[PDB]
Amino acid sequence: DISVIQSLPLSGSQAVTGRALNAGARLYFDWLNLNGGINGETIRLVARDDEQKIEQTVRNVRDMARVDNPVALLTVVGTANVEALMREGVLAEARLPLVGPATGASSMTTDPLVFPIKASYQQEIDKMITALVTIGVTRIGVLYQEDALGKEAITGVERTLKAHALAITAMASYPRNTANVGPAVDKLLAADVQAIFLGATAEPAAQFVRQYRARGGEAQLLGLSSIDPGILQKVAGLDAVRGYSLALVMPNPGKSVNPVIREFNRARAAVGAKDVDLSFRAVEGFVAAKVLAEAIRRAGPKPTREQVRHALTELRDYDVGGGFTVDFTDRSRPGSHYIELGVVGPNGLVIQE
Ligand SMILES: CC(C)C[C@H](N)C(=O)O
Numbered sequence: 001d002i003s004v005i006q007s008l009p010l011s012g013s014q015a016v017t018g019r020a021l022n023a024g025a026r027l028y029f030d031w032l033n034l035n036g037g038i039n040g041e042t043i044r045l046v047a048r049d050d051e052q053k054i055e056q057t058v059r060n061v062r063d064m065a066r067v068d069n070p071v072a073l074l075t076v077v078g079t080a081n082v083e084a085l086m087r088e089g090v091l092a093e094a095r096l097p098l099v100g101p102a103t104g105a106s107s108m109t110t111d112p113l114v115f116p117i118k119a120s121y122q123q124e125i126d127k128m129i130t131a132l133v134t135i136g137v138t139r140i141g142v143l144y145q146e147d148a149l150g151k152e153a154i155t156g157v158e159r160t161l162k163a164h165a166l167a168i169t170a171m172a173s174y175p176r177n178t179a180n181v182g183p184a185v186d187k188l189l190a191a192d193v194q195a196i197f198l199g200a201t202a203e204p205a206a207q208f209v210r211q212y213r214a215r216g217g218e219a220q221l222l223g224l225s226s227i228d229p230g231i232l233q234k235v236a237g238l239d240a241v242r243g244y245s246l247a248l249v250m251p252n253p254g255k256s257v258n259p260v261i262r263e264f265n266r267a268r269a270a271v272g273a274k275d276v277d278l279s280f281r282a283v284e285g286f287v288a289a290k291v292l293a294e295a296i297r298r299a300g301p302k303p304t305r306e307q308v309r310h311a312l313t314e315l316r317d318y319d320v321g322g323g324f325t326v327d328f329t330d331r332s333r334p335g336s337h338y339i340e341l342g343v344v345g346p347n348g349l350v351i352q353e
């Protein structure tokens with residue numbers, strides 16, 4: 001078989017996110033296999049829980065790269081986790097391409113073996129923050145994770161605001177791999193802010209939103225694509241989440257007619273993956289897997305790690321469906337140039353524009 005590996009959080013604070021990315025990728029490959037696989041070959045996806053622990057991501061990838069004979073690695077979660085794989089030379093040692101890292105950090109476009117797909121965090125921040133400034137907002141607060149993710153958020157928001165002669169009004173942090181946002185909620189509730197940007201992961205974002213609103217917080221809420229709006233409204237409650245602003249960097253699960261969403265639903269039914277729920281992060285995994293599959297297909301029979309890498313670097317506007325194209329020929333930017341703003345409607349529907 002042709003093997004592909006994944007190291008992500010299947011337990012712990014980030015379990016919801018890791019499970020979704022794995023579910024989407026597994027769904028796509030099971031679907032591909034039901035349809036004949038790739039050039040008559042079966043694709044095997046091997047996953048391993050890293051609990052989003054940086055050192056465990058490193059160990060997992062190195063171990064799997066040696067034992068599972070993979071041609072590529074898919075959707076690793078955590079800016080700090082991926083940066084460790086790059087910094088410690090794990091990918092270089094295995095000559096293993098990382099397709100679709102589940103983070104839009106700016107560093108994702110600085111490694112020959114890393115192939116970011118979705119529009120970056122900076123693109124998200126520029127679009128969302130500029131929209132706020134354009135409508136008159138001048139007082140912005142920021143919730144940030146106390147690690148590389150938070151640094152990306154603060155630096156990014158500060159950069160965009162500086163372009164408009166503005167600066168962050170208040171900021172508060174929380175520990176990575178936890179949802180301990182109590183102190184942050186206290187601080188931002190006291191701040192005289194009109195909007196609060198969430199540079200956080202799913203669980204802490206949800207806890208912050210629920211608590212902030214429950215205690216009288218009225219600021220407009222918005223955040224990075226690291227926060228699935230579907231999960232957010234489920235955990236924090238629609239009463240606190242309706243109105244939440246976001247940047248769409250993947251096909252919207254809410255648009256059932258979108259070709260990628262239609263394929264996801266057809267795949268789910270055909271495979272009989274009752275345990276898999278349609279969500280933004282699951283779609284991200286599905287999309288990453290499909291992009292990798294196309295590269296494997298182009299690599300030819302019994303493809304090697306080198307051939308797959310080569311194929312990836314030559315994908316020029318490959319359409320995953322509905323116009324969501326990926327171009328890896330320019331390594332200085334994300335494969336996808338797609339990005340639009342969206343909002344969570346009164347009843348929870350994610351609407352574009
Ligand atoms: C930037 C990362 C730390 C965020 C993480 N990859 C997530 O999707 O939750």
Ligand SMILES: [Mg+2]
Nearest residue numbers: 102103104226
């Ligand atoms: Mg992300």
Ligand SMILES: [Mn+2]
Nearest residue numbers: 262263266267
């Ligand atoms: Mn189809």
Ligand code: NI
Nearest residue numbers: 310311313314
């Ligand atoms: Ni070539």
Ligand code: NI
Nearest residue numbers: 323325337338
């Ligand atoms: Ni386009």
